[PDB]
Ligand binder design. Structure first.
Ligand SMILES: Nc1ncnc2c1ncn2[C@@H]1O[C@H](COP(=O)(O)OP(=O)(O)O)[C@@H](O)[C@H]1O
Ligand SMILES: Nc1ncnc2c1ncn2[C@@H]1O[C@H](COP(=O)(O)OP(=O)(O)O)[C@@H](O)[C@H]1O
Ligand SMILES: [Mg+2]
Lengths: 367, 365
């Protein structure tokens, strides 16, 4: 009966060193909810509406959306629903050097969404930690690189090459998953921060022409929260459990080989990123046409990313998209591709449900 | 016209099998003998007339020492005083607790002492100085189809086990030629002779324990009840003789699990043959009591031969089987339980033990 719509949001980034050296023009203007793109040639103007818009272009102009603002507007509802008993997903999308990693992870003195999410989660837990409710939290953090899966939260052994790949499998009920994945327990913010540091140090980064710290890999942060609660029953208590999966996803960029001066491994990994975005795009185009009566088959098996995220793009999750765009005029068509895929993702509808861990057993038939 | 009163008696976990987490295989649901294979390959069911669930105290029906005596042995005493013969067989494997079930310990005593004390008490109560009761006793063993007396001390030799032979008196029935009969008046007089005889009984260290019986044991009480004559003349004219028999058989002992070594293979065969004959006799008597014409094979074993008159006519026969509830002794418990069933066994399987969430059907119905 529920049909949860996907929460699309947009973030305009300020000018970069490259776009200031080449004195590129501003074309992405905002008025609040709406985002418009006045082409330089002045032959046509496009405009798009979204649930949420962020304008980090100027640190002084009114309407400046900060890390705390994007958090409190996007992630806090997802935290409320995750405590309610829903699965949640927040995934970034955009081009190279557009503010996806800065938006989600952030830097040391400019945190992104992930640390704030974990911090507020643990705060609400410590503030609701009664004997009525117990809380158990597991985390995983993994990487997709040249269609191979990798665990980020391990201390690699010394060798000429030490990256042990994992395999993806399909459980008939739970859906796709990764076999051999470290699921580490967490009690408070400190362990989370240490694991995040280890993961962001093990992640794949390189220096390319459009970002010196360009992530060469998709990154997924999974939190499994199990909250146990009681009901006065014929015997002992502690007989309700609610599980929730929170998937925070930072993806890479399209990376045109001409601008991004690339030869060898960068081309190779870059090409892999291009094949991962093409598949993802095709899955967001088929999910936006399957929510309009037309019947379509979503291709999730053509990429490990979309295969693992089968349950988030569709299926059972409350999901949100952060499109990242640059205001320069030298990237208009790529910004527009991002905005068109975001406006199509707006039309996605999922079926989110409470994970009472009791269906078909006894209280399903009570109900 | 009397069928056997077969009864079973499960024992509780001991120290070793409670420490080593040996799981329970024998359970109770009113039939009180259901065996769930630990792999749940088969669920057997062993309906019995009487059964004593001495597994854990908190269950209703914890059959204690007093319970088993007052239930199964005291009728044999009330019947002995009626002028009729009785036999009580004890069957169990090494470790089931047959000794603690029949004899008992200094605490929580057993069938033998309860029977003897109640006998002496009822005698002293019914005694009038016009009626009198006299008790003599004998104690022998059957070994490799041969007879031996247990109350005869032996001298200096390798060993002095002399064989006696059985003979049929045309009226008194079968008996042993050369058996020692000894008078008694109190339970110490019996306990002394028993602690003497169980030292000369046959025992050897086989594949099971070093103290495992390899011979059947018969303990016989002969009771003479004499009443006087009021018409005129001699007393000793109204005499009633009763025979109580307390037997202790050995184990079936399969050779597959115990590579018999020449002399441990001559005793297992004999025991296996005697148990088969005993089973045929009991099944034929049960079928007789339910209105059939059959023939009881007394003659295929010295045991049944000498116990003919105690296993036929107006006599009372009981058999108490002792079993363990551990999964370590499943092959032995099923053996003990199959040799005791005078009915049809019921084997089945269905994994309803764990319906996923508290009897799905109660609300899915
Ligand atoms: N809102 C912002 N304020 C200040 N600097 C920003 C902002 N957004 C992005 N940047 C800068 O731009 C770069 C973003 O690179 P990154 O987001 O990692 O690329 P990608 O999104 O392709 O992974 C960083 O060096 C960061 O300092
Ligand atoms: N029904 C019972 N209840 C409690 N304890 C028992 C029971 N049967 C046996 N036991 C304990 O286990 C032992 C009995 O085993 P035992 O008589 O040595 O076996 P067997 O007589 O077959 O050689 C005794 O030590 C006794 O304390
Ligand atoms: Mg990045």
């Amino acid at each position: 009966e529920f049909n949860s719509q996907v929460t699309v949001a947009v973030r305009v980034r300020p000018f970069s060193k490259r776009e200031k050296t080449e004195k590129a023009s501003q074309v992405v203007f905002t008025n609040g909810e709406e985002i418009t793109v006045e082409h330089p040639d002045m032959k046509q103007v496009y405009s798009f509406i979204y649930d949420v818009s962020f304008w980090s272009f100027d640190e002084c102009h009114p309407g400046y959306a900060s890390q705390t603002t994007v958090y409190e507007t996007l992630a806090a509802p997802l935290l409320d629903r995750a405590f309610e008993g829903y699965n949640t997903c927040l995934f970034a999308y955009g081009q190279t050097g557009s503010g996806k990693s800065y938006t989600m992870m952030g830097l040391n003195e400019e945190p992104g969404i992930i640390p704030r999410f974990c911090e507020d989660l643990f705060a609400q837990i410590a503030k609701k930690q009664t004997s009525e409710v117990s809380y158990h939290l597991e985390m995983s953090f993994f990487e997709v690189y040249n269609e191979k899966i990798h665990d980020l939260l391990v201390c690699k052994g010394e060798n000429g090459q030490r990256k042990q790949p994992l395999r993806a499998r399909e459980h008939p009920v739970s859906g796709p998953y990764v076999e051999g994945l470290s699921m580490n327990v967490v009690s408070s913010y400190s362990d989370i921060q240490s694991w995040l540091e280890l993961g962001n140090k093990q992640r794949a980064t390189a220096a390319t022409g459009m970002n010196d710290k360009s992530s060469r890999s998709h990154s997924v942060f999974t939190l499994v929260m199990t909250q146990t609660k009681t009901e006065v029953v014929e015997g002992e208590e502690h007989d309700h459990r609610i599980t929730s999966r929170i998937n925070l996803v930072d993806l890479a960029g399209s990376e045109r080989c001409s601008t991004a001066h690339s030869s060898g491994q960068r081309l190779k990994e870059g090409v892999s990123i291009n094949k991962s975005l093409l598949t993802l795009g095709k899955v967001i185009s088929a999910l936006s046409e399957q929510a309009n009566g037309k019947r379509v088959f979503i291709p999730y098996r053509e990429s490990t990313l979309t295969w693992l995220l089968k349950e988030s793009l569709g299926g059972n999750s409350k999901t949100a998209m952060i499109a990242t765009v640059s205001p320069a005029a030298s990237n208009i068509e790529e910004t527009l591709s991002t905005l068109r895929y975001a406006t199509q993702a707006r039309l996605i509808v999922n079926i989110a449900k409470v994970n009472e861990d009791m269906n078909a057993k006894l209280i399903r038939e009570l109900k």
